[PDB]
């Protein structure tokens, strides 16, 4: 595993992210059995984006297990960001707080409210969690342009983006301006369901076959090279996908892999 500074926070992150979702299928039990093996991985950065009291405590249960300093912890709100309040506080308290048994988060991860001001009584919030040492910072997830004025909020430590192939010039343009002013970036959708037809376009032949190299495992190659991603957020569903997820950051994509994909999109459009 390798590790990449979190922005100008001072701490480090591993470079693959694992999201734990809820999933009725996945009980206490498989949620530990899920976390050790990413700890043992050397995966020390979770994004909790569910409340599920299955996952709540077994992902707690298993964080438990390693000094808390070694970890670094993202919730995920979705909720409208303009809505957010003091209901969402509260919900906070019980389900990340109370439910994984943490005294702090190191990062709690909204959606862009397309403003430069968050909704008043969240923001008191949320500055009274920082005063009170329980909220490190908070991250912003985007698709488009962050106001500025947003981003120069001093809880703001972090954003997130879609980052892959297919991504255009706005998207890598954002992320590269991020970071160069010290936001953390983490990477989303590095081969989401949606984009994976890819595969059939013409000039995209060496996802399927390239020797050794699975098309997913191909296309995190290609999002783990990006320097402005802090870390690259991945979803797993069992111990196997996880270890083949890790092992992916120490592969070096061929050098004709990333040849191809330079000039992917040109032979497409040929
Ligand atoms: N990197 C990243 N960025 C994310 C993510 N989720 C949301 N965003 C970003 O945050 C913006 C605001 O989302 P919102 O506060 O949920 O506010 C949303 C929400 O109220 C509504 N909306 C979006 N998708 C749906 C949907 O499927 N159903 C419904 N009912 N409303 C939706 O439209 C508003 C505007 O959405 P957008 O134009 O997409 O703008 C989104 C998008 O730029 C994520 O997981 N990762
Ligand atoms: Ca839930
Ligand atoms: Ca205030
Ligand atoms: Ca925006
Ligand atoms: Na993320
Ligand atoms: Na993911």
Known sequence: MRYRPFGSTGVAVSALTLRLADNPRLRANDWRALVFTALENGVNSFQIDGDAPELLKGAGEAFA??????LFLTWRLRGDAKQLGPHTLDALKRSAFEGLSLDYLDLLLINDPQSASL?????????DLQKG????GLGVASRGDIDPGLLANDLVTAVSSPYNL????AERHRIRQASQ????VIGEDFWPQALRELADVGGYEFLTNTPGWSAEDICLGYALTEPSLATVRVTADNRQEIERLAAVVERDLPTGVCAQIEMARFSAQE
């Open 65 to 70: 297990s390693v000094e808390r300093h070694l």
């Open 181 to 184: 002013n010290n936001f953390a």
């Open 166 to 169: 297919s991504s255009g010039w």
């Open 133 to 136: 040492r329980a909220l490190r």
């Open 119 to 127: 909704p008043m009584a969240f923001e008191s919030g949320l500055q």
